[PDB]
Structure formats: C-alpha cells, structure tokens
Structure 1
Amino acid sequence: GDFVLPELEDVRAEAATVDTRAVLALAEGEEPAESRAAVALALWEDRSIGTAELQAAAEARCGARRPRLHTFVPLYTTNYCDSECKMCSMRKGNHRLDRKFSGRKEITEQLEILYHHEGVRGVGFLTGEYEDKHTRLASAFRIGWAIRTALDLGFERVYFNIGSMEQDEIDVLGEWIGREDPVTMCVFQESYDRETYRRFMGKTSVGVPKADFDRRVVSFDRWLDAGYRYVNPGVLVGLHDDLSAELVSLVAHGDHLRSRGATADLSVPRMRPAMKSRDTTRVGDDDYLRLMSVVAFTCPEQRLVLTTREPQEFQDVALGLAGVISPGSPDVAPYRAGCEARNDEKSSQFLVADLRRPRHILGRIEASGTPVDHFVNPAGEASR
C-alpha cells in the first residue's frame, strides 16, 4: 500500500485519450474522467494550449481555495550532512563549507526573531541527512524538540525537511507532537527517475544515506502509517532533462497521498547556484510556468510552494499559481533583528535570488491585494 511509481508508457497511453479542451471547460470542483497524471501529461503536451492560457486556467481552478496563501520561513539548524548530492553545497565531500550547528540558545533566538521581527507564524526546520542510526535518531530528537518549541511559542504551522525517515526515527520525532498538530513532513524526491537520481544522489550500499531511493520515496507512507496527515513531496527542477516524466511522477505521488487521506503541498524548486560537483539543466521560465500550471490545475487542493529561490520578478508572475509563499535564506541561523538575512557562500546550501526580509516580501503581497495567513505584519497597533 506504499506509493508505486507510475509506468510512463501507461500514462502516455491514457493521456492520448484526454480531451484537453473539455478538461479546460470543467467547472471548478469538477474532476476529469482520466487520472490526474494522464491529464497533466495531456495538458503539458498539447501545445495548442498556450502556457499563459494554462496559467490563467490554473489560477481560476484554484481561485476558490481559502486561505489564498499561507507562509513559512525556513530555518536551517545545521549544515552538516553525511550525504553527497552533487547539486548541493552541503554535500559531505565539500570541504570548503564552514560547518555550523545551532544549539538550544541559537534556535530559540532565531524563532523569536522570526516571530517578533518578521511577524511570521510558520517555520520550517532543515538539516542534512545522516548515515548511522544513532545520528539519525539524535537528529530526529533535536528537530522534534525544535518543532515543539516553535508550536509552544505560537507558530501555527511547522514544516520539517531532515531527510528520509524510518519508522523508529518518526517515533522519536513524534514524541514531541500530537497526531493532529500542524506539522508537515517534507521529503523532496528531487527526481523520480532512478537513473537521474543515482547520477546526483550517488550509489547505494556505500554510506551515502540519500542514495536509497526507496527508503526516501516511502517516507510519507511511514508518516501516514503513524497517524499523521500533512506531507510535502517535491521535484528539483533542473536535475532530470525530461520535465514531462517528472510532472507525471509528482502528480501521481500527490494523487496517491490524497487517496490515503493526506493533505499535501507540492514543491517544484528550481536550481540555484551552489558548490556543485555536477552541472544541472537550466529550465526556462516558460517551461517552468507551464509545469507549475499543469500541476496546480490537476491538483487544485494541493498547494504549490513558491520560494525566494526565485527573483522578485518571477514571484510577481507566478505567485497566482502558489498556495504557500516561503521567503528566507538557506544559511544556518541567518536571521538578525532589523538586518538582511545572511546567505554566505561559505555556509549556505545554495544562493537565493531574493534576499529581502520576509516581512517586506509578505507585506508587499498583502498591499497588492492577497492576504497571507500565518503572517501578522508587525505594524501600527501590532507594532511593539
């Protein structure tokens, strides 16, 4: 009953039977006759439907969803990692990185800055992924504490992204939270193509924890087995050259999670500069918007996540396709009251394109006419 990757040849055959114009004519809250993955593929490949027209249709099909947007800010709690992903600066073989680790004091200080100075009520905790069982359990323990601590401070939504998770590691993290707490597990498969995955994440059976594709991809099934609800699959756009394959796999994974009763966000982060050991594929804005549009349209209750990997000009264009906006920096403990967050090449996972403070980014979204849930702008009579 775990997720099984779809057979692309089978999806292609079903995609051939989809009437894409009829699909576009569907009322909001109406579901196509064919599978979501087949419809996504059919919309993707039918180039008589313009990308801008697909994006307009996606924004309308999602237009009823409330809240329109919510936010969380990432907080990297360490940049140690045992794995070796060739597109990521945190890879263990990158001896140039200055490695850092946040203790109790620093984690708490960062959460207070985010809460009081940035006005945010969503946070995400990130770590590397570790090889030996004891380290994995001790990481789960510390992140469980961070989650409980953020909820107790008044954060209303907590994400975590700490690697694949086995049953006993979920047990350790879970002793910190309740089954109905607003806690989302993030595990981005990066590529659902096993060969591209191996190229970037490494080979198995050699002490490289994220090289195990199968352990990673069933992490959400373990989380749902344990009685939790919120999950966040993702694809790293720019690893695999064939985007049609990845959108089929992601939509199929979302559909599986939906059928198990999960609430899923969907992440499609695009590559950013990093201290890489292998080059990646640059995906143009039209393809990327078409991918976002097709996923958002076929998965209208699963919010796309948009992040400050993208520059301000792209956020302007794409924000209507998103249901989560996540501004922040992938450096360890980077926030400081009144100051721009750090994004030091010597310690960050990658370089972001937008370094403006979260409360400025989110305040400008609100001023342009979209409320952001889990954002309390620290102004006026809410100004301290």
Structure 2
Amino acid sequence: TGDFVLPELEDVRAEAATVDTRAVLALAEEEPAESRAAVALALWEDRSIGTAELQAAAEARCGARRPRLHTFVPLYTTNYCDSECKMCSMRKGNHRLDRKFSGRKEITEQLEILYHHEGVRGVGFLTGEYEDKHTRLASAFRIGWAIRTALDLGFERVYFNIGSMEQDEIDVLGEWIGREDPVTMCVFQESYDRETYRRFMGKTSVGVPKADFDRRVVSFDRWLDAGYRYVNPGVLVGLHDDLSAELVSLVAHGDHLRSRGATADLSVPRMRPAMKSRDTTRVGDDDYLRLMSVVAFTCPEQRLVLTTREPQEFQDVALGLAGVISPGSPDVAPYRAGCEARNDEKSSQFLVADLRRPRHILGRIEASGTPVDHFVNPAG
C-alpha cells in the first residue's frame, strides 16, 4: 500500500482527450487541471502543436529554475553483472567483455582525477546488478563506502546506479551517509511496459535479478521509506516502440514521487552501440526533442538529465530542456589526468557519442552563457 502503481493507459488516454492543449501551453510559471500524465500525453499526441513550439514552451516553463544546470560525471566501479539485459554489453552472457573491478586505490584515484583535473563536484557510481543476497549486500557496502569517500573529498552531489534495492540493501548503503546528504538513487525502469521489459531484461525465477520488474519499480519507495529524498527514474528510449506509453508511465512515476515529497531527476537516455543480442529501434532527433519537451514542460521541477550518449550537436540543441548535464564514459576507471577518457568496446557498457573531456564540454557550455553548478573550471 502506497508504492507506485503503473497508470492504466486507457484511462490516461480518456483523460488526455479532455485536455485543452493550447490552454496548457498558455500557462505561466501554474498547473493544468488534468493530471500531468494526461497532459503530457495530450501534448505529445496533438500534432497541430509542432515540436519547435513545444520545445520553446518547455524551455520557457523551465527557464526560471535555479541553478539552470548542474553536473555529475559517471564512474563505473566494475563491469561485472549477474543480469542479462539484451541491449547492454555488461550482460552476463557477453563472454567477450573484459571484466574489471576497482578497489580502494583505483576508486580514490579516479575521484581525485575528476575533482582536480576535470573540476567537477558531482559524481555518480555504477555497478552491475547482482543475484544473490550476499553479493547485493557486499555491493551496497562498497558503493556506500565510495559515496562517503566522495563526500569527504568535497563532492557536493553523488548519484548511484547499482540496481534495484531492497530494504536491507538500503540499510547497508545507508550506514555510510546521512538522510540529508546530497545522494540520489538512480533506478531506470528502462521500459514500463511489462512485455517489452521481459523481452530485454528476461524472465523471473531463473537467477536474472533485473527480470523482477516489481522489485525494480518500487526501489524508490523503499528509499523514501528509509527517509531519503533524491531519486532519478528513467526510460531507455529505443526499447519500446510506443513512446506515448513510456511518457505516460514516466510522468506518472515522477508525479507519484513528488507526492511522496521526493526531489526527482528524469532520465530519457537513447540507445547507443553495444554488444547487444536483441533488436532496438532508433528514435529520431525531432521526436526525441518532442519527448524531452513534453516531459520537461509537464514536470517543471524535475530536471531532465542529458548525457554524452548524445553528440555535441544534439547537446547544443537540447541543452535548454535539461537541468542536469552528465558527461563521461561508461568504461571502468577510464579517466586520466591529462587526456580524454577511455571508452573501449571490450570493457564499456556502450559507446558514447561525445568523447570530449568533461572540463571541455562544461567549459564550452559556460562560455556559451549557461553556468554549470558543481563545475569549477580548472583553468580558473
């Protein structure tokens, strides 16, 4: 009782039909009468409102937010994984990946490189998801240590993306932090459609931990139950063919989290090349901007996260829809003091579209007129 329940798409569809979409666009920095999910669907589907109009409306409805942007850099602490996501190179059945694990010395060295050589004060920690309880607890212990270590080095925001979490695993991670520390739990549902989710994440009861859709989707509710605050749901764009369904589910999830008092960021990462075993689809740039626009407009206090899954030219076009910019590499311990990060196909989760160093990406954003919180350009 009280955890997130997936919206019924046909009911949202019926509500969406009552929405006055141009009256929605006329709203001031004001909430629509209908639910956010229904408004998001109505905007998405009303093709008499062009994407360019939606993007300008969303950039404007999110314009007064402060800070305009903050940053964090992902740090993959291992690429071992017990799960079998068919779009992901870390899937356990990819026997070609070179498996890596960072200990104390390597995590610390990487954090020091990011702080001193990239000038960032936000970091995220990633792992695979593990099957047996002891492994999940031991993983939570190590990541909790990493979070504590980053805060004590002066990082001011720490994300973690380490799989679904049960109450006892949150307890282990939580012994490393305080309920008010600036720590965000990331658990992207990938698809909120159970059939598409099964197609890529697997079936339950056969040792594949991410196959349990329900444990995954209530992880934020366990985090909030434990007293924490910051969450980051997400959809992987290119798994499910019907984006209207995913948009409804993501917005509804964000609305549920808001009702629980949470501060949420929203992620809509697009598929990148990986050692995949199932087919995915490419969502085009203008439709992807439409998705970002409708989400940012309807969820104006929930920052969209933009990453180096996108190339420089797309970042440029989309940046005013984002509240978080996250440059980095999904390779294990890939950062170097004086050159671009590694993104080796044999060890990374996927191939990035933008290999530039965070300080160069973020410095150019600042020079173009958007300050980036949690970035202190090393060039002074």
Shift of 1:367: 0.1
**What is the CA RMSD across the aligned residues, in angstroms?**
0.3
Separation in 2 of the partners of 1:281 and 1:379?
Answer: 41
Deviation string, structure 1 residues 236-279 (Cα, Å, up to 9, x no partner): 00000000000000000000000000000000000000000001
Could you tell me which residue of structure 1 aligns to residue 28 of structure 2?
A: 27
Aligned to 2:125, what secondary structure does the other structure show?
strand
What's the CA shift for 1:76? 0.1
Q: Does 1:72 align with 2:69?
A: no
Secondary structure at 2:271 match in 1: coil
Structure 2, unpaired ranges of 5+: none
* SS of match in other structure, 2:248: helix
* Cα distance in 1 for residues equivalent to 2:291 and 2:370: 23
1:330 CA drift (Å): 0.1
Deviations 1:295-351 (A, max 9, x none): 000000000000000000000000000000000000000001011100000000000
Q: Tell me the CA shift for residue 97 of structure 1.
A: 0.1
- Give the distance between the partners of 2:196 and 2:279, measured in 1 at CA: 12
What is residue 63 of structure 2 aligned with on the other side? 63
Structure 2 CA distance, aligned partners of 1:375 and 1:313? 21
Deviation at residue 68 of structure 1 after TM alignment:
0.1
- Cα deviation, residue 138, structure 1: 0.1
1:132 is aligned to 132
Give the equivalent residue in structure 2 for 1:219: 219
Helix, strand or coil at the partner of 1:325 = strand
Any idea what the Cα deviations from partners look like across 1:25-49, whole Å, max 9, x if unmatched? 0111x00000000000000000000
User: 1:285: Cα distance to partner?
Assistant: 0.4
Aligned position for 1:240: 240
User: Counterpart in 2 of 1:3?
Assistant: 4
1:379 shift after superposition: 1.6
Q: 1:342 and 1:379 mapped to 2: Cα distance?
A: 22
Structure 1 residue matching 2:165: 3-state secondary structure: coil
What is the CA distance between 1:79 and its match in structure 2? 0.1
- SS of the residue aligned with 1:188? coil
Q: What CA deviation, in whole Å up to 9, does each residue of 1:52-72 have, x standing for no partner? A: 110000000000000000000
Q: 1:11 aligns to what SS in structure 2? A: helix
Counterpart Cα distance in 2 of 1:194 and 1:95: 27
- Indicate the SS of the match to 1:304: strand
How far residue 111 of structure 1 moved from its aligned partner, in angstroms, is: 0.1
Q: Deviations over 1:339-372 (max 9, x none)?
A: 1100000000000000000000000000000000
TM-score (norm 1): 0.99
Shift of 1:208: 0.0
Q: In structure 1, how many angstroms separate the alpha carbons of the residues matched to 2:12 and 2:279?
A: 30
Distance 2:26 2:275 in 1: 46
Structure 2 Cα separation of the partners of residues 25 and 77 of structure 1? 46
Over 6 Å off, 4+ runs: none
Secondary structure, counterpart of 2:325 in structure 1: strand
Question: Counterparts of 2:113 and 2:279 in 1: how far apart (Å)?
Answer: 36
Per-residue Cα deviation, 1:148-176 (whole angstroms, up to 9, x for no partner)? 00000000000000000000000000000
Instruction: Report what 1:181 is aligned to.
Output: 181
Query: How far apart in 2 are the matches of 1:202 and 1:379?
Result: 47
Task: Report Cα offsets for 1:178-199 as digits up to 9, x if no partner.
Answer: 0000000000000000000000
State how far apart, in whole Å, the 1-side matches of 2:369 and 2:168 are.
45
Report the Cα distance in structure 1 between the residues aligned to 2:233 and 2:314, rounded to whole angstroms: 22
> In 2, Cα distance between the equivalents of 1:225 and 1:341?
37
Q: Could you tell me how far apart the structure 2 residues matched to 1:32 and 1:269 are?
A: 27
Distance in structure 2 (CA, Å) of the matches to 1:359 and 1:11: 43
For residues 279 and 358 of structure 1, what CA distance do their matches in structure 2 show?
31
Q: Distance in 1 between matches of 2:17 and 2:250?
A: 19
- Distance in 2 between residues matched to 1:379 and 1:315, nearest whole Å: 23
2: CA distance between counterparts of 1:156 and 1:59?
26
Superposition deviation, residue 84 in structure 1: 0.1
Uncovered stretches (5+) of structure 1, i.e. residues with no partner: none
Deviations 1:126-159 (A, max 9, x none): 0000000000000000000000000000000000
